[PDB]
Write a protein that binds this ligand. Structure first.
Ligand SMILES: [Fe+3]
Ligand SMILES: [Fe+3]
Ligand SMILES: [Fe+3]
Ligand SMILES: [Fe+3]
Ligand SMILES: [Fe+3]
Ligand code: NA
Ligand code: NA
Ligand code: NA
Ligand code: NA
Lengths: 174, 174, 173, 174, 173
């Protein structure tokens, strides 16, 4: 019993996709936790909460789109525990943005290794899938998060509660 | 005389594109044959017929797009005979779907060999051309045909004409 | 034998199958003409579109014959689609003259298909050929004739300016 | 100090991107110069002038998009002098089209070298950026310019002053 | 030689127009470089970048209009190298606005000298061309840029990182 659709689909890549699914679900969990941190009455930054809730839902499509690809190529989904975030309390708008930047770089590095695995096993379809749906999305998220961390720092965060409040209204509100 | 637009276009690639053109026209000929088999009064599954006529028309678009690529890069089109399909009677809805799956996996492997030729000849444009217009189209066609074969087999085909008739109306007649 | 067959001779069935192959050939010839004019060293965009259109219309002519075959209880048997005689079509004028020759040979095979149909007292098959092919062939042969007349009177194929202007004013709407 | 966004971005690619920005700006300068040559009262080909002014704006966009990519990846833009075109007088429509074809083929090989650099430094994002936004746009420009010299030559240019006039209105004026 | 349209167009004016074309292209290059400096992830002032990107596109059009003027009067365009900006790093929003103020005032001084060259050479058409399309455009640019440095300085830039951020949103936004 091997899948009728399987073709040029190496098993290391199949396993790498299964790990990537867990990573994207994890990322979505991190964002879910950040968003409702900023919903706390003693944090109370509504657009920070909306911004991170949006990222969390985005990561959930990233996970589902990878699950879709596995079935398309004949792989078999095997899910694992979605490890809890490293933090329940994110201290500040700035820290959350700095933490988010770190998370997206780790997902990016696992995606770049997935692409190297695909090219090494000469699977051009999986590589093009990775280029089209993830690599440029990661570069845009990292840059945007970089832009955000720069601005919060120059406004005087995190020491300046006035800085985070104004960033919340003028950049994250739209 | 070498073409005034030719650049970084190996002659092996040129021959390969011409080989792919014939394969795509062959594929479309195979589908045209399937389409009108199900138009026979003793088969009479009109949605199977419409399904395969569409795939036949899409394959010709694939062939024409390869001819467009050949001229774009400065190569020269050379057409060959379009051998007839290996069957005149396609057995059943299920069997036709299985043949289509087998035909599409062969076309995918011919495209995957074309991709290895382009990268070995350091032709990033031809590789990107194959990735965006053919590789994922083949992965989606192979998966869909696989879906169709699973459902037909689980419904009791080709044993029970009631299965193929119902599949013809509820899946292909949407 | 088919449950629907009545008055459909076995020669008619075989002739319909041969006509199907001829129409697919015709469609292949036009496909090859079309992308010749797409070459960067020919670059006649409307000559390419005109011949691509005829190739699609020939594609459909064959399918109507395949539908007719199933309709009358005959059985489709396909054959190889032999390659065109040429890979390079030389000129707009020459391609048009080649097309003129091709449509007249298909017309001659349709005229013989009609003579077989009347001889075998198959009035439906005769009407099928008259309604969908005979006048369509007479219209194509005349139009192709008009095109070779004009290209010659404009000075083709010697005058490269002739083929450019014809491509723009006649084939460009 | 290294950028907070930089990841998998070699210093060789960064330097190559800065040169490509200069090349794209150069090309736009060549086209800007061609455009106003045909605005001269003693040449007076309004659609040649409009056509080449369009290409100049296109190339200027090619440069701006490369600058966007540089900042996205954490590189730093370094601009250089924009050398003059090698001509002030472009002689004829045919000659301008021939010069343009040569210019676009030189940009294509410069972009193709960027692609091999990106793959050698295992930068799949940079490889995909070049494939989607530049390689096929260069292949399309080369083919169109080739079409333009074939027709202009076949009509009798540049000897035939009538040829360039008719080409100017029937091809470039549509 | 000499142009069939040329009339009352001195060669100093012709040569001065050629220099002005190069100056406008320079200005457009300077603005292009400022704009993408504020696109850096360690600056990230999205509206500062758009403000300067707009200025670069306008200067480009200013250059194109002068090239059009050159042809209208029968002069001949001769292009020159577009020297690179004097800085790669523009320090701050305030600093970039102060440089732009400086850049626009020197280009204004180049246009004012072109105007006296036109009046001295009794070219009423070229004088009116400059007054109509450039002189008041420069007077408005100088006034706007002065306004921006005043507000940025009065808000406390560049020390106040919060000032440039708020200016980026409420004045340039
Ligand atoms: Fe993600
Ligand atoms: Fe295909
Ligand atoms: Fe016909
Ligand atoms: Fe370009
Ligand atoms: Fe100006
Ligand atoms: Na790729
Ligand atoms: Na009749
Ligand atoms: Na009739
Ligand atoms: Na005409």
């Amino acid at each position: 019993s091997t899948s009728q659709v399987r073709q040029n689909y190496h098993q290391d890549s199949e396993a790498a996709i299964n790990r990537q699914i867990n990573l994207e679900l994890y990322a979505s969990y991190v964002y879910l936790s950040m968003s409702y941190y900023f919903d706390r009455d003693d944090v109370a930054l509504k657009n920070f909460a909306k911004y991170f809730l949006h990222q969390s839902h985005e990561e959930r499509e990233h996970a589902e789109k990878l699950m879709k690809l596995q079935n398309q190529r004949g792989g078999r989904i095997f899910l694992q525990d979605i490890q809890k975030p490293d933090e329940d309390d994110w201290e500040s708008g700035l820290n959350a943005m700095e933490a988010a930047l770190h998370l997206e770089k780790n997902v990016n590095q696992s995606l770049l290794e997935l692409h190297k695995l695909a090219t090494d096993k000469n699977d051009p379809h999986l590589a093009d899938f990775i280029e089209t749906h993830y690599l440029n999305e990661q570069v845009k998220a990292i840059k945007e998060l970089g832009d955000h961390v720069t601005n919060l720092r120059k406004m005087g965060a995190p020491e300046s509660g006035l800085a985070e409040y104004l960033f919340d209204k003028h950049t994250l509100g739209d």
